[PDB]
Amino acid sequence: QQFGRDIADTTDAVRDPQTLEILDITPCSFGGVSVITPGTNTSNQVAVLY
Amino acid sequence: NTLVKQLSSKFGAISSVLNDIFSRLDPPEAEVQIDRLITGRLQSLQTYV
Numbered sequence: 684q685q686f687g688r689d690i691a692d693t694t695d696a697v698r699d700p701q702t703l704e705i706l707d708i709t710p711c712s713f714g715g716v717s718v719i720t721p722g723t724n725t726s727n728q729v730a731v732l733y
Numbered sequence: 734n735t736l737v738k739q740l741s742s743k744f745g746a747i748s749s750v751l752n753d754i755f756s757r758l759d760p761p762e763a764e765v766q767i768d769r770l771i772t773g774r775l776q777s778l779q780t781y782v
């Protein structure tokens with residue numbers, strides 16, 4: 684066995700073809716951005732929510 | 734689960750992976766292949782919605 688697979692059929696683990704070891708792969712973080720603000724007539728400051 | 738599994742479908746094309754078509758086939762046919770895949774995935778998303 685060389686490389687694993689999840690339920691959704693995407694690679695998770697890989698064996699190094701040079702040294703006999705096992706590693707697991709996860710996509711680096713991602714998300715959405717939301718902007719919190721009062722009315723424009725009140726102020727111009729905002730806050731960010733990742 | 735159905736929505737996530739929908740990705741692997743060929744949708745009439747020759748493959749479901751973009752990199753293989755891009756690095757193995759010329760851009761003129763890549764246009765129609767990518768069009769097919771985009772149409773299929775938009776249809777799936779609209780159905781889910």
Ligand SMILES: *[C@@H]1O[C@H](CO)[C@@H](O[C@@H]2O[C@H](CO)[C@@H](O)[C@H](O)[C@H]2NC(C)=O)[C@H](O)[C@H]1NC(C)=O
Pocket residue numbers: 701702703
């Ligand atoms: C194949 O990979 C192995 C690693 O598993 C290499 O063996 C290593 O060699 C270095 C020095 O050359 C040692 O410090 C390591 O301890 C060795 N590994 C183990 C697990 O003992 C081997 O050299 C590689 N083969 C080739 C032809 O490069």
